[PDB]
Symmetry: D2
Subunit: 468 residues, 4 copies
């Protein structure tokens, strides 16, 4: 059961969020955010720049000073705050899911049942880690007592993409706040709305001023300012091609001949088409064993043709528009390159509507490794199907590219052989895009997400006489 | 490639080991240990009883006193001591492997390449854990610094069986010593020799006096004395349900084994499943806590499986353990010898189809022919009671849902042979056993849980000036 | 800031709780629960016996069956349920603190600010552990993939004492539920009410029927039935958590004012009814006289009276049996030669009130220095050296404390003291995250006792690092 | 008890070590390494450059290929090899200690009892970690079995300094090899000999060819080549994944209630150890005003009695500085101290006409703004500053973060300072106490050292009905 959406949700937040207050850009400039479904402007948004970032960083630094409310607060209480934030987001679940759809373009049913559900689960998961990340007491040689303490890194710069606005924000705030860091976040110009509203909930939840600061704006400006600021202790970027870069692209989905055909077909479809193909780990290279190639391809094309493209607020809609005009044209050019390179266009291939950034679900057959559409990730509804013969062969082709991969088979040995040989951060077996707030995700979440937001301090004390 | 064995190894240790010295029993009494291959006495061994145990526990307690060499020793050094012990055992590998065979009966080739090898790997694995089991610093509410220390439990009474004399000794000494505990060990009357020789190596390795004490003797005497001693902090028993009850009656842990299910699905690799099922049951003369004594086979492959299993059992070479061709030695002693025979009789009486073997394999020693019973039923005695002998039980089943219930209706171990991913995961999750093997059996590895049982957690919570994250 | 209490709270739950439903005993018998402050009956409570426990164990077993809602539920959801139960308890905080005081006797201010606060923290802490207790993937030799899974033990029998009725219930429920077990709980006959009301909240929270079952009654019957039941997987009273004679050591360099107030707290907290009461106060000779004098004055000013009065520091003892037992112990203290410094008798004609009592010049051989009476009776012993106090303190191991300004003395004592918990310059400082034991409770360690480890070892193609 | 050293150790290894073989530089160039005690050339050593580095990376990559002996080897066996290497170093301990002294200058007694002892303990410590670094099985939502594997990162570039040649080599090899990585190591031009001999022991121990490769040479060339190589997966510098391990100006705080005798001796050790060439040297000795005069008087007398001379002499406490460049830099800093107004209490000049010997130097009443109080010189130059309160000292000590120390008998003061000091390691009543088990950073050593040498792979499998 999904509640009826408000197809025209009101925008309450569209400025810079610093010290639990809303500010206009220092330059007073503002940029428009567009509804991808119509191509029309939703509203104006404050355009943050270097000077705005500097204000945010100063606020963050102040909120991180020894003796401050955030620093003195019990670890268990940071957990309480994250749980409270989660409760507030659930309260406004319907409103947030609709706003997400309005600004991003993804189907409202998905925004509500998937995006929001995962946001809630992420924050509540991290709330639980707040007071459970232990240091150690170490049995060092000599008459000493040695132990470690896991301290926060400090001011963390977070730049999040537009594909999953709310979930990306939660993935970043969850682990950072659980460990006691302060944040200066930059949201995507294409999808700044929902994150700004969450900022309002962060204040309502009771987080001290300056703990979380959000600076909407442009990449070359605000984004770069955060990455270059001398008082930022850590910067985590997630998007297109302490510092951590989280990029995604060309994930191989391997279908063995003994795989369940119906399941394989639906999963490979999902693996690529999910969220308009706008996923860092989209299974954009579907490797199919020769014995089942023809049948698999036939079923895949049939599924792609039946995929409903339309108004994201319509319950029947499976695919909304692409995020913006730039991606829209980028995907169209990519489809043309596929045709020019000799890939067999099986269906789709063009615009799906005269209004908005809609593209027909496209499928290319007989794709080769050397082709552009087999090497470049375009984050669009364009499926690439490649044929292969042996398991040894596919391993090499799949690895010749490492965020994620998948293998569909009923054979135990094949599953274990492939899961070990595939060089990817996450390897799915008979499923795809299965993330858990508790399962790590990286390239070549969970408790591992905490390591990156913590600094280790070792204290070694001379004692009278050590005894086991 | 295995060195030529001294079929008649000299015995250097046969007394009570306390404070790195050899002592005769207080009573001066001694018991004989027999070579199961000939039925002849190997030598006399000091018979420890309550008073001997009391001396051992006193020595152990003294070595565990605060400020003692063992207590003050760096954790990394406990690791060095364990590594030195392993080096010495390896130096005397050929000798020990032969002594093990002589006293226990297992094939020398196995004693050398399996038993010793695992003893070495176990001690070396644990040596590495000595300085790596950390306590925690805890983010408690308020202005407090709270942390935990994992201290040793103290005096640990360890009673080990006769099936894997040396390995059981390593499995107990490894985790206990790595964590800084002291030990009072009671070895099996049927196999006391190897453990006593290792005691000599423990002394040579440099372990302080009283850290490890070994009292050979009888179960209801020495064994019960350890379990009932008021100054023993922990007692771990590994063996038959029969003596376990006595110990339970006399921190306590009872490690028993029996009737482990080996499930063969229709899609299993036939050649592999047959050889593995054979190994699963027959390994170590069937004297294994997790012996696959219930081989469930899906109906569509039952006939073929049984045929191949019977052929394999008939070809199993029984004979002198010191002969390189020997696959199966004798049973550990006369009591088990007759107990197994009675069990085979019961199988016949109950309607089980005797497919091969079923009787004595030699006029000298405790050798029994590899026996296989077909069409076994859940209600039969040979399908409910574990006899630790070379007697295989093959049961037929139809569905996977069915076999789960039947396998669980008994939980040390279990195995599944199948090429199907979903079938492997379904069974590994559904089978209620401590260890579930998939397409393999008896695959143990020295490889943290064993450490928890050997440590005490102490929390220290200190008031401090204002706390900050 | 404590809301005014309802000094005579309504009782909504007084029956056996099985499968989210209220049941009368099969015998239909009931027993009275008394208000220790007046000696009068509060209400009748269903007297569960063996047959009632049997119904509870079966309901638990059913709830634990593979494929059941509690077994199939995502680990994260068990956490959501724990968090919802905490929210409900917080909603009914004022009411529950009053009921706890009515039935147990402790001051309402403490019930509210201490017991209820700790209950909330305990449940919320454990809610966080539900989906974070990982198994391991092990690098075994050979071409094998080996891993472990932490499964619930099953039906857990839990016997809760009367000293901290609500807190002990939370300490037992938190880890057990976070790990997916089912429970059959036996509450103390002296204090059954608060736990039964929490059962109602357990049902309201959404826990499946049979996950938590509560059987009020007596120890020799209901308690023994749980302990002997063949279908109960684990019983926690096998693990026995007992407490007694915890040493509180005051070094000559301690902060005098702080040590005096803390030693007073250490012993008198909860009418001295605490498993780790600092009932042996060891004081170094150079400060003994002054420490004793200040301790005596503090004991004399301790306000004893109606626990609902804001000024009350000490309520009555839990029941008449304890009341008499403590009085007999005070008499033995005088007979054996301990110096009675203050108190020593009954504090009121109604209720089980005892005057705060302090004994000086206590010797290790005395009965009052060896037997724990769980009462408002302080023992002050004198010592000379740090080496001496260690031996005396250890000659008894749930807890201990040291008061000193010296780093080395503090580290030497915290290591040498054979106690499960050692406090330095504080006392009774518990955290839902810090372990406690003489098995272990609280923290991550509390999860170990409620889990079975299953190893799965799979043969795989060709293993690579 | 230390054996008699060979004051003229023979050199057996002086080339590039690749695939368990000794190679001359492609250019055939060599550079002389000097004995800092005499200023004379010990021998010539192959001068590796980009081309030699490329060969080592290729050998390392090959040894890391799936299916190779190093990749297939049981984890426990990597541990056996590390223990064998340790046994071989122990066999050649007397020789190694003398060669360390000949090339670096530190007292032979220290090389034998300290450096070599720590090298042995470090390798033996990591040998034990080889098969104990577990992944996890995660309780994810839904009918899925999710687990992680900790895989090696791959080709690790390791650049080690000259202050502790052998120990630094072991700190890098231990964790890298225990977790199955392969190495391309660049040793310091000032001290390449001991590491090259160890490579010979690595071969003798049985490590597969290409697992460890060592390229002696210069920083701007060989080092830069490793850091910039496209096929190097991680680079660790001490002096792709990158980690810079730098050190400097660690504060040693002496409270008025400290044990005077122990504090004076430890402060002396804290600064003067290893000719002052230690990243965490206690180069800022803060002394509480009530004990200042006496502490200084004692420190001066202790510095004046410190024996400087031939490092092979058993009475020698201080050998020469590592090279001419450091010698001059220290003389420059001493002059800077005098010109700045710091009170020169003793030393301050050249201690011998041959070699690079400097007199133990003590500056008194140093103030925070002085250059000698802000820059690290890695020399036998002690700075003593005066302070009044604990709140004051915290701020002064922090205004600079690898290490710090506090000497006091008071529990609260020790906890206050160990909490407040922003340093990776805080020692209480001791200094320079390292354990192979305790982490060190500004991480290395302990369990923490393994995290940087491993990649986390998550495998998530769809399974029939899941149950707890
Ligand atoms: Na938009
Ligand atoms: Na024998
Ligand atoms: Na009552
Ligand atoms: Na040199």
């Amino acid at each position: 059961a999904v509640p009826a959406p408000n197809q025209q949700p009101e925008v309450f937040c569209n400025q810079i969020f610093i010290n639990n207050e809303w500010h206009d850009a220092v330059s007073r400039k503002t940029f428009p955010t567009v509804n991808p479904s119509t191509g029309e402007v939703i509203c104006q948004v404050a355009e943050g720049d270097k000077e705005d970032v500097d204000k945010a960083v100063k606020a963050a630094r102040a909120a991180f000073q020894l003796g401050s409310p955030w620093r003195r607060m019990d670890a268990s209480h940071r957990g309480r705050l994250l749980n409270r934030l989660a409760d507030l987001i659930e309260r406004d679940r319907t409103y947030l899911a609709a706003l997400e759809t309005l600004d991003n373009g993804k189907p409202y049913v998905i925004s509500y049942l998937v995006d929001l559900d995962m946001v809630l689960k992420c924050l509540r998961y991290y709330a639980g880690w707040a007071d459970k990340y232990h240091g150690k007491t170490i049995p060092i040689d000599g008459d000493f007592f040695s132990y470690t303490r896991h301290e926060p890194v400090g001011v963390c710069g977070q730049i999040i993409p537009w594909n999953f606005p709310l979930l990306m924000q939660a993935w970043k705030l969850g682990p950072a706040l659980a460990t006691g860091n302060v944040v200066v976040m930059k949201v995507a110009e294409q999808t700044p709305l929902t994150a700004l509203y969450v900022a309002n909930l962060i204040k309502e939840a009771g987080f001290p001023p300056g703990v979380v600061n959000i600076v909407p704006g442009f990449g070359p400006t605000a984004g770069a300012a955060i990455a270059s600021h001398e008082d930022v202790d850590k910067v985590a970027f997630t998007g297109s091609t302490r510092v951590t870069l989280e990029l995604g692209g060309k994930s191989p989905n391997i279908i063995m001949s003994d795989a369940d055909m119906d399941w394989a077909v639906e999963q490979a479809h999902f693996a690529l088409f999910f969220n308009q193909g706008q996923c860092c780990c989209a299974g954009s290279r579907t490797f199919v064993q020769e014995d089942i190639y023809d049948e698999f391809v036939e079923r895949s094309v049939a599924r792609a043709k039946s995929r409903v493209v339309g108004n994201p607020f319509d319950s029947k809609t499976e695919q909304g528009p692409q995020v913006d005009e730039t991606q829209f044209k980028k995907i169209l050019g990519y489809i043309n390159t596929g045709k020019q390179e000799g890939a067999k266009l099986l269906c789709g291939g063009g615009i799906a509507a005269d209004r908005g950034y809609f593209i027909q679900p496209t499928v290319f057959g007989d794709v080769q490794d050397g082709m552009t559409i087999a090497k470049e990730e375009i984050f669009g509804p364009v499926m690439q199907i490649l044929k292969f013969k042996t398991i040894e062969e596919v391993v090499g082709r799949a690895n010749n590219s490492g965020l994620a991969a998948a293998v569909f088979t009923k054979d135990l040995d094949k599953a274990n052989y492939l899961s070990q040989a595939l060089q990817a951060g996450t390897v799915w077996v008979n499923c795809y895009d299965v993330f858990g707030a508790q399962s790590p995700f990286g390239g070549y979440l969970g408790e591992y997400g905490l390591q990156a937001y913590t600094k280790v301090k070792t204290v070694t004390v001379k004692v009278p006489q050590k005894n086991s």
